[PDB]
Write a protein that binds this ligand. Structure first.
Ligand SMILES: O=c1ccn([C@H]2C[C@H](O)[C@@H](CO)O2)c(=O)[nH]1
Ligand SMILES: O=c1ccn([C@H]2C[C@H](O)[C@@H](CO)O2)c(=O)[nH]1
Ligand SMILES: O=c1ccn([C@H]2C[C@H](O)[C@@H](CO)O2)c(=O)[nH]1
Ligand SMILES: O=c1ccn([C@H]2C[C@H](O)[C@@H](CO)O2)c(=O)[nH]1
Ligand SMILES: O=c1ccn([C@H]2C[C@H](O)[C@@H](CO)O2)c(=O)[nH]1
Ligand SMILES: [K+]
Ligand SMILES: [K+]
Ligand SMILES: [K+]
Lengths: 242, 246, 242, 246, 242, 250
């Protein structure tokens, strides 16, 4: 193996330069299966890698696990192997009252509520998505007719306090995040998730193209805890970026 | 007058909701003149405002002056009068050796090296341009055939130390900014300018649409201190983008 | 022209080493006219420059525009031309209930709510005025008998949120500045304006002398939006600093 | 299921209040197997959970995945199910030349180079391990005779730049971390790993007991990129400490 | 004299490598007097130094004065003289309702609300006590049967605002610390004092062993202003560390 | 006693509203003895307090010890007992080559390299002296004849690494302060000391008047440790100035 964590070699990728990067290892095979000649390559820790073919070109599907840190490992090591384009596909909680469960959200840029992004660029640097990737994602969503929102995402190193959840062991939120959800809504932020800030920052600051799309599984103006269109979209976007 | 600085009334705008915002008051009339029925509205401090017409729709052209603070006054007060879309047109100096004088830069988001943006959103919030504005700008540029770069801009509160210029009175740069250009360079940042961080942050965090386009007048990989046809390209592009956003 | 923005040459200055720097280009000629042999030198963007003579010495009057960034340009380029002493004359909003519209405020040092000052010295460095300049201004005010307050000024990169104005398009103020006016008042801060923090920091940290005086045009304990003694004072101070 | 990520119920735990939290799901079963009556409970994402028994008391073994964020999910949700003591077992790379591959490191507190800990307590709050857990870990180490170091650990959100690795795609490290390893080295810091800052801070600030132990697999004073008997030592140590904290 | 402030020579120490460091100069002799052959060595500014003998080994008692800054001088200069182990003995205000006046508090690590610690290590570095020292203190306290709490301490550069006291000349507390005591209680912090952050950080980051114990003189859930078990404990702990 | 640390009552002050505040408890009596009717009030920890009379008015002299934190206690407690003007008197080491041993420094404001000032106002607030105090100090200096420098002082919570000293147990300086002395020098900072940032910030933000003067006893840019005797005399010079300044502020 050529990389320390993923257990992959340059050769396993077979010239692939695009990766769809879901968070959950168990959803890797599922995404791969929507393409041609899906093949499992490796599985170590939270990193599960499949290779498939899309319009006759090799494409990687590799899971990041939850969070900036493991994402930063996946992305670095895939880049070493030759990946230049990363499409992230996630689940997310919407924080605006007009976004519905099942809606698709495309992130133009992220509020950096993470630690890992600071390891690539200082805070003033925008966690901005690649324009071609964003365009591909928006356009893909248009063509499958999914209801889509485009805008800014709050990207948090935690699922609980950083997203201002109060149903927790302690029931408290640190001073810094008390009242934070409401500030982000006032600023038009669409949703919370946990990886985009890292992904976008590490890519934007290293010449790698990244885009970001998520399916809404809960609306935070209703509920803290949650009770496929996006997967179709990310694959179709990959198709346009090949 | 309905606003404190611009010396304009809601009426003067005639239902305009889009503004082209150059930095220089003297450049305002030139831009308005590319459109129909250009009329001077007002001129106070660095804020010169003309109204014109584009495919029969009223459009504002308004100068920001240099820097976030004055930009923030013009944007706020325009927003009060009904503007909802802001297209910035500028000059800039590239910091990438592949970008040439004459090229056009469309900013997706900015490195926030300014003070005003912090007055609208904390630092972690992205100084990101509106997707539709960026699209219109990129498409306008394609349509007139300019060689174009799309990416990140470093937006500084100073022309000198914040852009790591050493050829100054003191000849020196504060510790924080020493070696900073080389860092932005490695991170793929295209250029320095002085207003976008404020503009993009204040718009993105208040439901206002903003976009940024600039023509390259100098390249820092050869010179610190700094062609008329280059800003003619950029102006043409911004006006054409306005057309698509109406 | 010897400088990139002001369109002036060393020669235009005629040995001048002192500049009165108002914010508004339209008030430059007005100030120059209080001195002898006033002459327009240049006008570019927000930078309008006149030269005049005071007790037989050449003096510059040059506008900064609104805000640290354009101020930093004017001051840098005037320094390059040989100016060593900067007197700022502005308009301001008082935030103490006992300071009246028409009162003259002399800044000893500023609360740095700007970005540009950080490009000259880190935050811990005081935005302090020069002692000779402050003395001149205080003494000038005494001799024309204007009612004067001497003390600390909050210098803000914005006119709206940074000065906690709520009559705005959005009607909100970012968390950081919510309740900030009241903190500054409790701390004895006299007023808000937008340039001193930049001016004072850039000069104090480069061996340039700077002083700062403003006429109060609104009292913020009453109003957000506003409805010449100071000009006389700045000129008279210049006279003592020659 | 009672918790959103782990896929467990309060019942599955059978009154367990202590959890051993390795990073790697694949290591969970190995650890459980050193105890009595090991049973797989659940496996979702990077979270694999086994239950076992230690001196007749139920004990949880549950993987965190790599990094503070997923760690914080595991710990929060385990806390919701009744766990009050967390023992982390890891692999690490030492940055002191006197610490050898094979040595065991017990962390008293961590340099907080992570994002998640800030979600529980501001930066000035110490990422400090629980005194009893640290004592149990040190005593367990002594009892099996491993050569042990007790001290401060640097806990980074990245494996690469945050640990000042240059042998990467870009070959560069952000200004903030340039020269950082030499600083931690001078300050007596033993090693880099990626979870403890989050773990220790979130437990220390919520009345939960946490401890940290790792086996040294590589030494940075010779190599960036990286024996089976070393982690066998550390695992033996963590289980024995668990025994003493029951 | 070998050091700039303490007026001591290597030789005065007679091979001592452990120092008990109280805050108050007047309490130095008192502590020394609990050991054998107590001898006054020096007295300059807030730094009073006695030497005594404990189980036939020389031991220093040296006062730090109040606050990180003077502490940092004492510790640095003692270290130059050969001290490698520092045991702090202080008075403190408890902020948990269950901790009583007279109780003994052993600090595992401190919330760094001081300035001096940042001069040794950046804020992300833990103000953690040495494990052997903490063990010695805890065990000492067990053996003399004093009622003891072990945990985190908030260490503040001020006695008034940084500990959220309101009975002051001004009666205000700066925004940053408004509501701070309650946050620290929620987080399990036991108490306020003023030196541990500096001591623990400067020691932990230079290979010096440090421990921290204090007797509770006020409970802040009742009172702002206050109306020997700890001294016995620090001495006994020194004994175990020799 | 009316205050927790100083062991003073409002009555002890006899209506005093000005205090001279040196660093060292042992210099308090010496300063007070320059004035009339000097009397010891109290002595607890590093806080020694004498009262004297200047042109018929009662005046306090009170030591702060070293550093923001204790200064903060003394100023607060003095303020509660009715003090409204604080004059800091010290000795210091210059970092500018033109400033000589023997010179006198009046500080207009300080670089805040301390912790305690943040407990009073956020970092952006200037650690600035009161204008009347600074004027009185500069004018006192001019009247007794000192060669005076007026400007910015760097106020540090440590004597060693924060002042960039490498002659230490560890011989190293934290990243933040590495190369910092050269930066302050380039920015015209006159000297380092250890209390002004706290004092000036806590006063300027609470309607208290503060000022500071110091004699130069050493210069970091030259070699040349002067002398025990030249240090004693420079110190007397500066004390003479603060007292004379106190006169003008009464
Ligand atoms: O409300 C929600 C729903 C989903 N996620 C994300 C991204 C992360 O990997 C994982 C946590 O459930 O899914 C959230 O952060 N918040
Ligand atoms: O190198 C350059 C060229 C242009 N500008 C910008 C934006 C600002 O208003 C003005 C200064 O020349 O133009 C720069 O900042 N840097
Ligand atoms: O309340 C007020 C009145 C005036 N100004 C200032 C300085 C700036 O250039 C311009 C904006 O009105 O005037 C303020 O900041 N606040
Ligand atoms: O040099 C090393 C060796 C191991 N780890 C850790 C903790 C993290 O979960 C995972 C990454 O390899 O192992 C490091 O961070 N750095
Ligand atoms: O509530 C209290 C009681 C005592 N001390 C401390 C430590 C410092 O040296 C001195 C100041 O009173 O005593 C406090 O900080 N807070
Ligand atoms: K993970
Ligand atoms: K301007
Ligand atoms: K002290």
């Amino acid at each position: 193996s050529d990389v320390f964590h993923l257990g992959l070699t340059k050769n396993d990728l077979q010239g692939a330069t695009l990766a769809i990067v879901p968070g959950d290892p168990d959803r890797v095979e599922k995404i791969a299966a929507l393409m041609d000649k899906p093949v499992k390559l490796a599985s170590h820790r939270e990193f599960t890698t499949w290779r498939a073919e899309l319009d006759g070109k090799p494409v990687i599907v590799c899971s990041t696990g939850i969070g900036g840190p493991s994402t930063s490992i996946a992305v670095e090591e895939l880049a070493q192997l030759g990946i230049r384009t990363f499409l992230r596909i996630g689940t997310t909680g919407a924080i605006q009252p007009h976004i519905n469960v099942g809606d698709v959200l495309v992130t133009t840029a992220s509020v950096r509520l993470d630690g890992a992004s600071l390891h690539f660029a200082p805070l003033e640097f925008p966690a901005v998505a690649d324009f071609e990737c964003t365009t591909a994602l928006v356009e893909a969503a248009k063509s499958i007719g999914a209801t889509t929102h485009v805008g800014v995402t709050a990207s948090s190193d935690t699922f609980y306090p950083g997203q201002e959840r109060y149903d927790t062991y302690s029931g408290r939120v640190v001073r810094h995040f008390k009242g934070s959800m409401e500030e982000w809504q006032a600023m038009g932020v669409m949703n919370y998730e946990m990886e985009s800030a890292t992904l976008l920052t590490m890519c934007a600051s290293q010449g790698l193209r990244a885009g970001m799309v998520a399916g809404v599984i809960v609306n935070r103006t209703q509920q803290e805890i949650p009770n496929s269109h996006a997967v179709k979209i990310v694959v179709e976007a990959a198709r346009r970026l090949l």
